[PDB]
Amino acid sequence: DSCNSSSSDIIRDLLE
Amino acid sequence: PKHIIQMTGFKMEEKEALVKLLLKLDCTFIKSEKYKNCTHLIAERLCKSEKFLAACAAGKWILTKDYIIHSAKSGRWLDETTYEWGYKIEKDSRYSPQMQSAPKRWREELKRTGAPGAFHRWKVVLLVRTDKRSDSLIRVLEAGKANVILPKSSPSGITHVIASNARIKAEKEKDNFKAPFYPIQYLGDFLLEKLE
Ligand SMILES: [Cl-]
Ligand SMILES: [Cl-]
Ligand SMILES: [Mg+2]
Ligand SMILES: [Mg+2]
């Protein structure tokens, strides 16, 4: 859901 | 003794059911993808969300959903202790004993030493890849009471350079800073894995 789309790994997001 | 509640890792239907139970208790609930200084984070699982890392860095309570279910049934916020992520460690787990205990370790350590966060006295320059937002990293760092040095602020006293691709930068580029370079992953490792 767009209303509930927080990342579960903000470290991984910065490496991709 | 306030109860400022946030939740991480739950799908919409699970979150709806838990927030419905909060109506039976005096509390604040903050709906945001961001960490917003909750006193109690309800976590579906151990993870590396902004909320989870920031709550660790500030020594907050990170608890299972049973804390809400049982408190609402009792009509009163219960003792957090047995609901904490870290109260009991799984010997057979994909997560290290350090990661499984991280919320308890930081909550107890900050109380022991008196420090207000895991990164207190850090003065951090971020060199994050220009195509992406550093905003979540900044809020985790600031939740741990690090000072994030903006470009317009003096570099005096910098302690850490946290950099995208820190491990491939030339020494000549590293020489633009007195402080050592750390990869992005260091932030997560310091909180969740490192044996201090
Ligand atoms: Cl939320
Ligand atoms: Cl790196
Ligand atoms: Mg304290
Ligand atoms: Mg150097």
Coordinates of C-alpha atoms in Angstrom, one line a residue, chain B residues 5-78:
Chain B
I5 CA 3.7 4.8 19.7
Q6 CA 5.0 4.1 16.2
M7 CA 5.0 0.8 14.3
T8 CA 7.4 -0.7 11.8
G9 CA 7.2 -3.8 9.5
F10 CA 3.4 -4.4 9.6
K11 CA 1.2 -4.6 6.6
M12 CA -1.9 -2.4 6.4
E13 CA -4.4 -4.9 7.8
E14 CA -2.1 -5.8 10.7
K15 CA -1.5 -2.1 11.4
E16 CA -5.2 -1.3 11.3
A17 CA -5.9 -3.9 13.9
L18 CA -3.2 -2.7 16.2
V19 CA -4.1 1.0 15.9
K20 CA -7.7 0.0 16.7
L21 CA -6.5 -1.4 20.0
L22 CA -4.7 1.8 20.8
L23 CA -8.1 3.5 21.2
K24 CA -8.4 1.6 24.5
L25 CA -5.3 3.3 26.0
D26 CA -4.1 6.8 26.7
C27 CA -1.3 7.4 24.2
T28 CA 0.0 9.2 21.1
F29 CA 0.3 7.4 17.7
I30 CA 2.4 9.0 15.0
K31 CA 1.6 7.9 11.4
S32 CA 4.8 8.5 9.4
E33 CA 7.3 6.4 7.5
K34 CA 9.9 8.5 9.4
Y35 CA 11.2 8.0 13.0
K36 CA 9.4 10.7 15.0
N37 CA 10.8 10.2 18.5
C38 CA 8.5 7.4 19.7
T39 CA 9.0 6.2 23.2
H40 CA 7.7 2.7 22.2
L41 CA 8.3 1.3 18.7
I42 CA 6.2 -1.8 17.9
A43 CA 8.3 -3.9 15.4
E44 CA 6.9 -6.8 13.4
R45 CA 10.5 -8.3 13.2
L46 CA 14.1 -7.4 13.6
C47 CA 15.0 -5.2 10.7
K48 CA 16.9 -2.1 9.4
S49 CA 14.1 0.3 8.9
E50 CA 14.6 4.0 9.7
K51 CA 12.3 3.6 12.7
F52 CA 14.1 0.5 14.0
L53 CA 17.6 1.9 13.7
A54 CA 16.7 5.3 15.1
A55 CA 14.9 3.7 18.0
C56 CA 18.0 1.7 18.8
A57 CA 20.2 4.7 18.5
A58 CA 18.0 6.6 21.0
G59 CA 17.6 3.6 23.4
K60 CA 13.8 3.4 23.0
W61 CA 11.6 0.5 23.8
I62 CA 11.3 -1.8 20.7
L63 CA 8.6 -4.3 21.5
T64 CA 6.4 -7.0 19.9
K65 CA 2.8 -6.5 19.0
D66 CA 1.8 -8.5 22.0
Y67 CA 2.6 -5.4 24.1
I68 CA -0.4 -3.6 22.5
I69 CA -2.7 -6.6 22.5
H70 CA -2.1 -7.4 26.2
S71 CA -2.1 -3.8 27.3
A72 CA -5.4 -3.1 25.6
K73 CA -6.9 -6.2 27.1
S74 CA -5.7 -5.2 30.6
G75 CA -6.9 -1.6 30.1
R76 CA -3.5 -0.3 31.1
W77 CA 0.0 0.0 29.7
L78 CA 1.9 -3.0 31.0

